[PDB]
Write a protein that binds this ligand. Structure first.
Ligand code: HAS
Ligand code: HEM
Ligand code: OLC
Ligand code: OLC
Ligand code: OLC
Ligand code: OLC
Ligand code: OLC
Ligand code: OLC
Ligand code: OLC
Ligand code: OLC
Ligand code: OLC
Ligand code: OLC
Ligand code: OLC
Ligand code: OLC
Ligand code: OLC
Ligand code: CUA
Ligand code: PER
Ligand code: CU
Lengths: 31, 166, 554
């Protein structure tokens, strides 16, 4: 199991997800 | 050792490529949603509507800013805004809260930004074309318009105002 | 030097690198001042004394973007993506062509510099009509870029020549990367060639009265997007094919690396409307199309994130690091050639994330044209690409010159790399945040000090970044000139092979690989995607042109 690679792509997915849902929320506040 | 490691990295890569794709497609669904609701009014009508930037301040709807706000529906206003170096007319744009605003924006000189701080109206203004965008202000007060496209040495100070009346 | 007779391509590659680097240093001088600006501090009166030809923040900004995002990046791409395939194949590039390419770049640069330095082309590196720059900006810029066509030709030549000697062999990894990369670039570039040729050049010489803004932006952005992938892929070739050796490990998968690269060939060009979400006159449906396509183009980097991560893990395990974190400690954090690329990969995480936000059509209305965008792209190009270039200097420079890197120079290198990195991360927090508070990009804000009170906190980050990055640039100048202007030489450094990584064998499927080697076929597909994504819209615009007079407002 490439366990270290998995952590990195976990951190990437959370980064993506936070940025995204973060910005989407803002879009609706300003909507 | 290696042959083991390479199979396992590959097996998990596929997992991740499948998870990533799903994530992306979820975002595609979530964007499609926004497209079906009133908040999508901020997307320009992508209709071409050519005008002459050299006469736009001397004939037609941009040449009289005090008459630029016209009721066009039982609950609809259309506003003919001019973005120019370095300001907007009318100043202020005055509209009622809760009504639908169709902003029709053009420029007599260079490209400007039309970005209404506090809202999702954020549209490029190109000389020779009209930009059409829709918004309903849900809260009275003063919103500031910012130019977000470099337009020359007056860029930093190109501001306008929209007053949404109670 | 007898090394330069055997390998004249070392001298040429050297000249690209150097020119590209000079260009980065001059371009970067403006950086710190711009950071202090987004920090509400006006230090322009100080720049204007040190460099009295600078009439305005905007002329500085033109120089910065053009020098850093156009020139350095291109020279770097042309240095890496010719020379690396050459060495893998162990064959001479057409040297006559290669000097030609360098002179076009050089002369184009000098010629465009003239109106730029004289305040006749303050239009930024996007040069959007009606903003009307001097004819020498358009002509210098056009010859500068066309120089890449000669490079495209050089690599395909090398490629065919090897296939001639070796029918029924797969193209070697680096060479496959460079071929698909150069072919993508050919497609990508036609948007700007068309805009310079039908519109910009004739207009700048007064042969037409106006130019249509809509059609010019549209043609611009056809090239505008894939130019960025054009900046990145050289760093990727290194990260794929060199990084793993430098990490102490190996490339975990040749096929996966070709796959990433193939996908870039297919998806880099048909996505330009993601820069036109806020433009009038383009149907919403097309903007949805391009939005989808852009999320696809994210895939090959999502792919790259896992392959490279796994390669690094493998390296850290080989090197004796146990655990879920222990492989990170076990990596060679003393080697600047390892550290720079890896750090750029670090920040590429949030940068990629910002990117995905930008792609999402309606979400772009939140961030379009705010400090957010510069925050996004400093992670991508100012950090990951530039850092990759910088770091690689520690192997590339001895490989090409024969000069040794001393330990002291290594350490200076670490410091620069780290400071540059940290500065970029700090500034990315300032700009993203600022962008969320509706602060515009491309503005001399310090000059309207009371406009954005709400941004006081993120501004302090921009100031802090300003200083950190001043320090790292000063360190980078001082370090770069030690190595380059050093008395000693050592030619067996210039002969020791490039540190190319070894792959791990486990059968891949040879069929996937063979399928990916159908390069003409994939090029066709890529060409068709552009026609389907641009054609309908360009047909509708070209049938309704509205040229408008040009302005000079600087
Ligand atoms: C090199 C240069 C650039 C790249 C690459 C880049 C990538 C993206 N961008 Fe972009 N961006 C946009 C879309 C994205 C998309 C979807 C991506 C994607 O390709 C990103 C995908 C990447 C990822 C999903 C991240 C994967 C991360 C990796 C690979 C990290 C691995 C970590 C490891 C391995 C570490 C492990 C090691 C340890 C020790 C732990 C759009 C819109 O859709 C806009 C316009 C917005 C607007 O309003 O104008 C835009 C505008 C810009 C600007 C401004 C243009 C201007 O002047 O107006 C520039 C120059 C630029 C640069 C670049 N852009 N972009
Ligand atoms: C010493 C580090 C440097 C600093 C502190 C830094 C800072 C900045 C800031 C503050 C701006 C935004 C200015 C504005 O929108 O008004 C900017 C814009 C820019 N920078 Fe940098 N920069 C650095 C290095 C580079 C690097 C290496 C690249 C290219 C590889 C580069 C590419 C760009 C581009 C293309 C723009 C946009 C200019 C435009 O909107 O026309 N930066 N930089
Ligand atoms: C290095 C890994 C990248 C992690 C940085 C991503 C930033 C995430 C959230 C900031 C939002 C705060 C609210
Ligand atoms: C490395 C650089 C990292 C850059 C940092 C940017 C990080 C995350 C963006 C997330 C967007 C943040 C959105 C928070 C606001 C929110 O959630 O919105 C509700 C509010 O009512 C609306 O007005
Ligand atoms: C984010 C999660 C992405 C990682 C997805 C993990 C997928 C699981 C997987 O692919 O597991 C195969 C392996 O052979 C098991 O035996
Ligand atoms: C196992 C497979 C199942 C995986 C499914 C993933 C679910 C994710 C997103 C669903 C999309 C939800 C769409 C609803 C959006 C509503 C919204 O956000 O409303 C905004 C606003 O308040 C009104 O105008
Ligand atoms: C680390 C990152 C930290 C992220 C902080 C993001 C903050 C705000 C975005 C929210 C925007 C919501 C827009 C509402 C603005 C508004 O109400 O203002 C105008 C109006 O005039 C009133 O009458
Ligand atoms: C002005 C162009 C000078 C060209 C010099 C060059 O690179 O060409 C080599 C030439 O044959 C001389 O050695
Ligand atoms: C080869 C070198 C130079 C080409 C010469 C090009 C010179 C053409 C000069 C045209 C010119 O400057 O016309 C400006 C006019 O005011 C409209 O903008
Ligand atoms: C380059 C060839 C010059 C074409 C210029 C031309 O024919 O101009 C058309 C004009 O705009 C209409 O009167
Ligand atoms: C490969 C992907 C190709 C196909 C992907 C999806 C395209 C389908 C429909 C777009 C609908 C968009 C219409 C939005 C108009 C919103 C509006 O009316 O603006 C006010
Ligand atoms: C916002 C501003 C803050 C920005 C910081 C973001 C992350 C910081 C550093 C990333 C580097 C991660 C890995 C560092 C590893 C060094 C290591 O493990 O060293 C081993 C030891 O030296 C034997 O070599
Ligand atoms: C919290 C305060 C805000 C940050 C202040 C900014 C920079 C401090 C300078 C840091 C310089 C980092 C040097 C690390 C270095 O050179 O590390 C070699 C190392 O052993 C592995 O590669
Ligand atoms: C050893 C070296 C480490 C030192 C690095 C510090 C680490 C991070 C903290 C602060 C730096 C802030 C510097 C910013 C300088 C002035 C900010 C400013 O202009 O203040 C505006 C004020 O909010 C409106 O009145
Ligand atoms: C290389 C790393 C360089 C790290 C630089 C840190 C900047 C200084 C921080 C100390 C605080 C000084 C701020 C005191 C004056 C603030 C002020 O007066 O603002 C104008
Ligand atoms: Cu008008 Cu910037
Ligand atoms: O260009 O993103
Ligand atoms: Cu793009």
């Amino acid at each position: 199991k490439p366990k270290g690679a998995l952590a990195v792509i976990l951190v990437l997915t959370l980064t993506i997800l936070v940025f995204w849902l973060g910005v989407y929320a803002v879009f609706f506040a300003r909507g | 050792d290696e042959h083991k490691a390479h199979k396992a990295i590959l097996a998990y890569e596929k997992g991740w490529l499948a998870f990533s794709l799903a994530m992306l497609f979820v975002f595609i669904a979530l964007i499609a949603y926004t497209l079906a609701t009133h908040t999508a009014g901020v997307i320009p009508a992508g209709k071409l509507e050519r005008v002459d930037p050299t006469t736009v301040r001397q004939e037609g709807p941009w040449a009289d800013p005090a008459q630029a706000v016209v009721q066009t529906g039982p609950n609809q206003y259309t506003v003919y805004v001019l973005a120019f170096a370095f300001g907007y007319q009318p100043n202020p744009i005055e509209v009622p809260q809760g009504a639908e605003i169709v902003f029709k924006i053009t420029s007599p000189d260079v490209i400007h930004g039309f970005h209404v701080e506090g809202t999702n109206i954020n549209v490029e203004v190109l000389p020779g074309e009209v930009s059409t965008v829709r918004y309903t202000f849900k809260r009275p007060g003063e919103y500031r318009i910012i130019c977000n496209q470099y337009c020359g040495l007056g860029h930093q100070n190109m501001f306008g105002t929209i007053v949404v009346k109670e | 030097s007898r090394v330069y007779e055997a390998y004249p391509e070392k001298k040429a590659t050297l000249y690209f690198l150097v020119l590209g680097f000079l260009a980065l240093i001059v371009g970067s001088l403006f950086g710190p001042f711009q950071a202090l600006n987004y920090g509400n501090v006006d230090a322009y009166p100080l720049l204007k004394r040190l460099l009295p030809f600078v009439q305005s923040y905007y002329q500085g900004l033109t120089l910065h973007g053009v020098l850093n995002a156009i020139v350095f990046t291109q020279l770097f791409a042309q240095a890496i993506m010719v020379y690396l395939p050459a060495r893998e194949l162990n064959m001479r590039p057409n040297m006559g062509l290669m000097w030609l390419s360098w002179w076009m770049a050089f002369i184009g640069l000098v010629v465009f510099a003239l109106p730029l330095l004289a305040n006749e082309a303050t239009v930024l590196y996007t040069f959007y009509p009606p903003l009307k720059g001097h004819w020498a900006f358009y002509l210098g810029a056009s010859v500068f870029v066309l120089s890449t066509w000669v490079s495209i030709y050089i690599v395909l030549d090398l490629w065919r020549r090897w296939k001639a000697a070796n029918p029924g062999k797969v193209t070697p990894l680096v060479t496959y990367m460079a071929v698909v990369f150069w072919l993508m670039w050919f497609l990508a570039s036609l948007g700007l060639v068309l805009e310079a040729v039908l519109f910009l050049l004739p207009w700048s010489f007064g042969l037409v009265e106006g130019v249509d803004p809509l059609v010019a932006r549209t043609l611009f952005w056809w090239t505008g997007h894939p130019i960025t992938y054009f900046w990145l892929l050289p760093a990727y070739a290194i990260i794929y094919t060199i990084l793993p050796k430098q990490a102490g490990g190996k490339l975990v998968s040749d096929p996966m690396a070709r796959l990433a690269f193939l996908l870039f060939l297919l998806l880099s060009t048909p996505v330009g409307f993601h820069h036109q979400f806020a433009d009038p006159g383009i149907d919403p449906t097309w903007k949805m199309i391009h939005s989808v396509l852009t999320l696809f183009v994210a895939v090959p980097s999502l792919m790259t994130a896992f392959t490279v991560a796994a390669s690094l893990e493998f390296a850290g395990r080989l090197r004796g690091g146990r655990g879920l974190f222990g492989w990170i400690r076990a990596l060679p954090w003393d080697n600047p050639a390892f550290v720079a690329p890896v750090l750029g990969l670090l920040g590429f995480i949030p940068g990629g994330a910002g990117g995905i936000v930008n792609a999402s059509f309606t979400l772009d209305y939140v961030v379009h044209n705010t400090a957010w965008v510069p925050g996004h792209f400093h992670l991508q190009v100012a950090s990951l690409v530039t850092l990759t270039a910088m770091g690689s200097l520690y192997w590339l420079l001895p490989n090409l010159t024969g000069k040794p890197i001393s330990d002291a120079q290594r350490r200076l290198g670490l410091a620069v790399v780290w400071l540059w990195f940290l500065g970029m991360m700090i500034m990315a927090v300032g700009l993203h945040w600022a962008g969320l508070l509706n602060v515009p990009r491309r503005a001399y804000i310090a000059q309207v000090p009371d406009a954005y009170p709400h941004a006081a906190v993120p501004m302090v980050f921009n100031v802090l970044a300003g200083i950190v990055l001043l320090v790292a640039l000063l360190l980078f100048i001082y370090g770069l000139f030690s190595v380059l202007l050093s008395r000693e030489r050592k030619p067996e450094l210039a002969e020791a092979p490039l540190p190319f990584a070894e792959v791990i064998s486990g059968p891949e499927d040879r069929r996937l690989v063979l399928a990916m080697d159908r390069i003409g076929f994939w090029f066709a597909v890529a060409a068709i995607l552009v026609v389907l994504a641009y054609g309908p819209t360009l047909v509708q615009l070209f049938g309704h042109l509205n040229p408008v007079p040009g302005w000079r407002l600087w």
